[PDB]
Design a protein around this ligand. Structure first.
Ligand SMILES: CCCCCCCCCCCCCCCCCC(=O)OC[C@H](COP(=O)(O)OCCN)OC(=O)CCCCCCCCCCCCCCCCC
Ligand code: SF4
Ligand code: SF4
Ligand code: SF4
Lengths: 171, 96, 90, 70, 209, 156, 303, 176, 74
């Protein structure tokens, strides 16, 4: 409800990555990646974020974790939590607690960097005349300047299609 | 020509006697088809026969309240007719 | 955070509906899998298509037409490939 | 006849008539006869910011026309 | 109500065991412990959708064994109710096929017409469905005066209604797509598997008892 | 005693709420099923009583046992009875099912569906005429009108 | 005042859904030859009140679950999607003006796919799992189509605001320059709401019930903005909201009316039909609605 | 004589083949089905309001299993056992005795309502029209004890009315 | 020919091919590009005055600069 909401959503984000890096059942893993993707959408929309963060939401939380949950539903069983999973979850919470505690009550925390520790209203636009939400016009390129890029991308996806049908019994 | 309907469509509303009278048989169960007044009967209940409906909606009973004494304004049973009306109401005849 | 307020209200009122509904009364096939992958790949090609209505106001219009027709054309070739080559059959 | 189904669709359509109309009334009440200003570009938002700055009441609807010129 | 144990390669089949016998009732045994006239209604109700041709077949079994021909008005009235029963079983089989294939509404259209037909059975004997009414020796207790004109009325209105059924379905595009390719029957199959009537009409051979 | 008064009023409201709609499941073994579908027909209604004919077992209010119960039928019938919510009621329709009936002196027939599930409402007939069945469901509704569970709970 | 706005949106959804259920029962009663429900009071509005409170009263499905939290977590998600889809829907003034809203629509459709799949996995024994798996397949095969079609109709207007859509509908209805695209779009809405003529043959049944019907009203309102409607003079919003409600109601009655009279499709006919007939036809309409605004000098003022 | 179906071919002429193509790509006879269904919408449906309006019948319905009696007279049943001799589920149970007078009569006249399939055979077999299938069909009985008729129940049920039974028989004592 | 068998595909190819071709025979594409170019996003930036060029008009009323007139007349 205040200024450091970007940093707090980042806390919940890395908690979600710990929450499925502890290796649960993979449908709990699909849950963890959905929650993590939602708050990542929140973070990038706090930078605004006007198109691309709503675009990732359709792909990963719209078309990828669907198929990961599908494949969890059709392939693996998990017919019944454990020591090692939740112990790693505890130590991940401990490591994030330690790093954010030292960001709070000190200057800076250094893995090998100097992360200047305070919340980010810095930096931002100085109220410029955007008038077109610069993300939007940037991605409204690729069809004037983007000759090569979209061609090799679509070609790669076509090759992905013929690859998938071959390994699942071409022709 | 819908003004020709609701002019006639109110004639089964106020011709009943009033609006609380219209509310009576409406919330009783269903009917608003009043208008023929064929025959009442001891133990209360009244019998209305109209011709312009089809065969299955000629003869309808209107039950009264507490004929045996069990608050039968609501929760109307069947078989609350005397037997000669159980001949007439089941379309076994053409005369009351 | 304004739509986060709306999301919070909807989420909380939904939880109130459910938990007050609950305090009160007391093998597989490949054919299942190919349609999902074909969804996935055509959905990613949808993702490459969909900034098209952004792009239509530029000073390079013929080229945009050509590569937009190329994207839908390549998508059509992929479709017709798995169409002809017994990809969706029963 | 279907004179008896029109009460159902009538009440449900009234239930769909209400939210946009009452919302538009709350829009007009939340700025005093104004419409709430839409905001899609940086240009409109900065113009809204200088408007709510110059108003004195820190509110972008008082609209302070022609009576602070000289 | 059946039991179906099928064995399928995926969204397809391989085999199916119809476990039937859920509805065994011991009808032949109970008829072996009764008389003829008493045990007629078991023949009435082993089949139940068609309901007076069963009567008709039992009455003809006894009359053919007993070397006694009914009077001619009995034969023609029995033909009339055989036609009502034929009409009734085919209209319900079409509508239950439609209801189970999907297709909510023509079920109820044709069941209102069938409600007229059960009114006709009521006026004939009194029962809704399992009217015994066909004794061996011809029909018992003939019709009340004022029924044939009602059947005339039903003939006119029902010709109109069945043409409206073919108005609805039959060039239904997706119902045709739903049932065309399935259910092939070879003539050798229609002989060796012992099929009867409508299957023989449907697959090839001109045949009618 | 407006506490008791609130008890009686709220019991009326919840029991009217139960008896108002009452969507059944039609189990429907034999020709009694054909007469039940004839009271699903356009003449004898079921929409008017909130009664939605529905093959779902999971949400079954009442259950219309009709047709003819057999020995091969019975364990599957009671398994249908189990996966069913505990506020539930049973209409035994038909002379076959409420006492063995015309196939009484026979093997492979349980002598009425009393010997499997409890029965609230028997309705006889062969078939019970659709009108009479509709009367039977009305007297089921009046049994629901007299059930006094919340009375028993408050003065329990 | 803003929480008052939210509650004035998500209070009438219960009214709308319950009275939609009696309206579908009544309208099927008159497509068929019935009447009623009308013994439950006058014409039965207390009839949805009564069965709603009955289904709350009736004792729940006993578990028999797997991960209690997951089992509660699926229908809570379904209903909060059905609530959080009505935020950028302008009848004249939407709740939230956005830079882009139609992608938000499609995103929440995909989260409905999540609802189906989670309830299916956490549900039960294996046969219902196969059934829900086919259901997820036949749901996800149409979000290709509806996103394609929605893209090619907004390309006529270039922008994503949807208030630019209610501007650009002012002269003609948008059914006229895109009738086949709109037709296929409407069929895909019948796919997304998962009704007849498309097959699906739980707990809590009221929540799945609610999500179904609110999804239908969602798609109908979105249609009614998207393809037809009329103008909006400012400072009189009752006018547009009346014409909007009347057109959306006629369309939802047409929706249930199409449901009333068609048998359900065979499954491989459904997938076959989608791919081999709606997919090349959609690509045809997309390439023509790309190459034609560059033809007829008509490219939108995408500000 | 036979009149079979499905013997045609799709006509290769350009008008007919483009008409089948127009139906394929334009969803036409589906909308024709919608038009037929809306025609049935705009009719008035035929329901009967059940607890008030009762669906029609015949004079010869088979219902209640009532008894009759003589004009100001005694019980019409002689106990001549024909109904139990014909009763195809044997639900009749007759045990007969004379009384102190001399006329032969009964002791125990029981109808099971469970086994009684409602034939009509016991009506037709009765030489004196003692048992009569009644007119009304509303039994709806909450307990299985209560569905087992005694002779006294049958006499009360024959004295809750004769007038219906008498009118039905006096109309149709000429067919049977 | 195959218009009898797989009709919606042949219709899709037909509208596809005309969508491919039709900008070749088109008297409006140059109009589209002039419309699309002649709409300014940024500021129309001026320039330092003079090598005494008979262009770059001084008062914005002066029609020596590149203006639009086919806009107003459709
Ligand atoms: C979700 C979504 O689409 O949110 C859109 C909104 C950003 O608005 P947008 O339409 O992208 O353009 C800026 C002008 N409103 O996004 C926002 O307003 C996001 C605000 C951040 C808090 C919510 C985080 C969600 C998790
Ligand atoms: S009682 Fe009669 S109608 Fe019912 S199942 Fe038995 S034989 Fe059939
Ligand atoms: S046939 Fe008639 S008189 Fe004879 S025993 Fe039976 S009911 Fe009595
Ligand atoms: S109607 Fe039939 S079963 Fe019933 S008592 Fe008479 S003879 Fe027996």
């Amino acid at each position: 409800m205040m200024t450091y909401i970007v940093f707090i959503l980042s806390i919940i984000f890395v908690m979600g990555f710990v929450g499925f890096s502890s290796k649960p059942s993979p449908i709990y893993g699909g849950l963890g990646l959905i929650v993590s993707g939602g708050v990542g959408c929140g973070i990038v929309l706090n930078f605004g974020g006007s198109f691309l963060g709503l675009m990732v939401f359709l792909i990963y939380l719209g078309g990828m974790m669907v198929v990961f949950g599908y494949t969890t539903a059709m392939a693996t069983e998990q017919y019944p939590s454990n020591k090692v999973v939740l112990g790693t979850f505890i130590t991940g919470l401990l490591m994030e607690f330690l790093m954010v505690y030292y960001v709070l009550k000190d200057k800076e925390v250094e893995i090998v960097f100097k992360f200047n520790g305070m919340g980010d209203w810095v930096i931002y636009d100085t109220g410029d005349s955007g008038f077109f939400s610069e993300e939007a016009m940037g991605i409204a390129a690729l069809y004037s300047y983007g000759t090569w890029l979209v061609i090799v991308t679509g070609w790669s996806l076509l090759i992905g299609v013929v690859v998938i049908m071959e390994i699942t019994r071409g022709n | 020509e819908l003004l020709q309907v609701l002019k006639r469509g109110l004639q089964q509303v106020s011709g009943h006697g009033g609006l609380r009278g219209y509310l009576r048989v409406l919330f009783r169960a269903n009917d608003v088809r009043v208008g023929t007044l064929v025959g009442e009967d001891k133990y209360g209940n009244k019998y209305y026969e109209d011709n312009k409906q089809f065969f299955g909606r000629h003869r309808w009973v209107i039950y009264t309240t507490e004929m045996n004494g069990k608050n039968t304004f609501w929760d109307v049973d069947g078989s609350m007719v005397p037997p000669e009306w159980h001949r007439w109401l089941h379309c076994m005849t053409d005369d009351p | 955070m304004n739509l986060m307020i709306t999301l919070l209200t909807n989420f909380t009122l939904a939880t109130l509906l459910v938990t007050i509904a609950f305090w009160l009364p007391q093998p597989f096939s490949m054919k299942f899998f190919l349609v999902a992958i074909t969804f996935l790949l055509f959905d990613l090609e949808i993702a490459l298509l969909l900034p098209l209505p952004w792009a239509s106001q530029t000073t390079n219009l013929n080229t945009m037409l050509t590569m937009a027709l190329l994207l839908i054309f390549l998508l059509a070739v992929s479709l017709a490939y798995e169409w002809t080559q017994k990809g969706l059959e029963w | 006849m279907w004179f008896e189904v029109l009460p159902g669709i009538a009440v449900m359509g009234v239930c769909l008539f209400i939210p946009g109309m009452a919302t538009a009334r709350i829009h007009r009440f939340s700025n005093g006869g104004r419409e709430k200003r839409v905001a899609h570009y940086s240009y409109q938002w900065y113009l809204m910011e200088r408007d709510r700055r110059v108003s004195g009441v820190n509110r972008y609807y008082v609209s302070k026309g022609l009576e602070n010129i000289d | 109500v059946l039991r179906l144990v099928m064995e399928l390669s995926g969204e397809m089949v391989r085999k199916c065991d119809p476990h039937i016998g859920l509805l065994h009732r011991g009808t032949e045994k109970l008829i072996e412990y009764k008389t003829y006239l008493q045990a007629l209604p078991y023949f009435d109700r082993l089949d139940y959708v068609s309901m007076m041709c069963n009567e008709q077949a039992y009455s003809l079994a006894v009359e053919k064994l007993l070397n006694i021909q009914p009077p001619p008005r009995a034969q023609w009235i029995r033909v009339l109710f055989g036609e009502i029963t034929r009409l009734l079983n085919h209209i319900m089989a079409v509508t239950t096929h439609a209801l189970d294939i999907g297709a909510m509404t023509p079920f109820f259209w044709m069941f209102e017409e069938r409600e007229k037909m059960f009114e006709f059975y009521e006026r004939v004997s009194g029962a809704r469905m399992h009217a015994a009414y066909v004794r061996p020796g011809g029909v018992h207790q003939d019709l009340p005066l004022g029924l044939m004109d009602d059947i005339y009325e039903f003939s006119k209105n029902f010709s109109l209604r069945i043409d409206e059924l073919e108005e609805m379905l039959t060039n239904n595009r997706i119902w045709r797509n739903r049932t065309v390719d399935i259910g092939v029957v070879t003539a050798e199959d229609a002989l060796n598997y012992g099929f009867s009537g409508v299957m023989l009409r449907g697959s090839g051979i001109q045949w009618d008892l | 005693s407006r506490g008791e008064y609130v008890v009686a009023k709220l019991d009326d409201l919840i029991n009217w709420a139960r008896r108002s709609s009452l969507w059944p499941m039609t189990f429907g073994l034999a020709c009694c099923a054909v007469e039940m579908m004839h009271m699903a027909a356009p003449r004898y209604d079921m929409d008017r009583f909130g009664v939605v004919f529905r093959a779902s077992p999971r949400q079954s209010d009442v259950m219309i046992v009709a047709g003819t119960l057999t020995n091969k039928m019975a364990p599957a019938l009671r398994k249908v009875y189990d996966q069913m919510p505990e506020p539930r009621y049973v209409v035994s329709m038909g002379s076959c099912a409420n006492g063995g009936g015309y196939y009484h002196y026979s093997y492979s027939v349980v002598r009425g569906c009393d010997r499997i599930v409890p029965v609230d409402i028997y309705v006889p007939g062969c078939p019970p005429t659709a009108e009479a069945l509709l009367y039977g469901i009305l007297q089921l509704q009046k049994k629901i009108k007299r059930e006094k569970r919340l009375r028993i709970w408050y003065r329990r | 005042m803003f929480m008052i706005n939210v509650l004035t949106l998500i209070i009438p959804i219960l009214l709308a859904v319950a009275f939609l259920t009696l309206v579908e029962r009544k309208v099927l009663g008159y497509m068929q030859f019935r009447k009623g429900p009308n013994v439950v009071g006058p014409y039965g509005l207390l009839q949805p009140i009564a069965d709603a409170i009955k289904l709350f009263i009736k004792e729940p499905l006993r578990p028999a679950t797997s991960s209690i939290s997951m089992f509660i977590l699926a229908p809570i998600l379904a209903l909060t999607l059905a609530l959080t889809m009505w935020i950028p829907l302008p009848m004249p003034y939407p709740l939230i003006n956005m830079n882009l809203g139609v992608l938000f629509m499609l995103a929440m459709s995909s989260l409905a796919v999540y609802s189906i799949l989670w309830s299916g996995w956490a549900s039960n024994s294996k046969y219902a799992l196969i059934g829900a798996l086919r259901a997820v397949a036949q749901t996800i095969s149409y979000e290709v189509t509806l996103a394609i079609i929605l893209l090619s109709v907004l390309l006529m207007n270039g922008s994503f605001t949807l208030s630019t859509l209610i501007i650009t509908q002012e002269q003609v209805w948008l059914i006229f320059p895109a009738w086949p695209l709109a037709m296929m779009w409407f069929i895909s809405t019948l796919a997304e709401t998962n009704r007849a003529p498309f097959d699906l043959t739980a707990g809590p049944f009221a929540l799945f019930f609610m999500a179904e019907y609110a999804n239908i009203i969602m798609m109908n309102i979105f249609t009614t903005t998207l393809f037809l409607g009329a103008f909006h003079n400012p400072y009189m919003p009752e006018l547009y909201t009346i014409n909007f409600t009347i057109k959306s109601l006629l369309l939802s009655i047409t929706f249930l009316w199409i449901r009333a009279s068609y048998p359900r499709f065979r499954y491989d006919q459904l997938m076959h039909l989608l791919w081999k007939n709606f997919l090349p036809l959609t690509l045809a309409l997309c390439m023509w609605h790309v190459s034609l605004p560059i033809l007829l000098s008509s490219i939108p003022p995408q500000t | 004589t036979y009149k079979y179906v499905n013997l045609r071919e799709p006509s290769m002429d350009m008008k007919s083949v483009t008409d089948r193509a127009a139906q394929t790509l334009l969803w036409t006879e589906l909308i024709r089905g919608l038009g037929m269904t809306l025609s049935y919408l705009f009719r008035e449906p035929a329901t009967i309001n059940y607890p008030f309006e009762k669906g029609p019948l015949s004079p010869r319905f088979r219902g209640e299993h009532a008894l009759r009696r003589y004009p100001s007279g005694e019980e019409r049943c002689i106990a001549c056992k024909l109904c139990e001799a014909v009763c195809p589920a044997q639900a009749i149970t007759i045990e007969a005795e004379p009384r102190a007078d001399g006329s032969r009569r009964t002791t125990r006249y029981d109808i099971d309502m469970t086994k009684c399939i409602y034939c009509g055979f016991c009506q037709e077999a009765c030489p004196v029209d003692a048992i009569v299938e009644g007119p009304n069909f509303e039994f709806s009985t909450e307990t299985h004890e209560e569905l087992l008729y005694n002779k006294e129940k049958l006499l009360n049920n024959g004295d809750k009315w004769e007038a219906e039974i008498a009118a039905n028989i006096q109309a149709d004592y000429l067919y049977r | 020919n195959v218009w009898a068998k797989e009709p919606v595909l042949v219709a899709s190819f037909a509208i596809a091919g005309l969508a491919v071709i039709l900008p070749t025979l088109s008297p409006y594409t140059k109009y589209s590009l002039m419309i699309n170019r002649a709409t300014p996003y940024n500021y129309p930036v001026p320039l330092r005055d003079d090598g005494n060029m008979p262009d770059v008009p001084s008062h914005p009323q002066d029609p020596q600069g590149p203006s639009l007139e086919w806009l107003k007349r459709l």
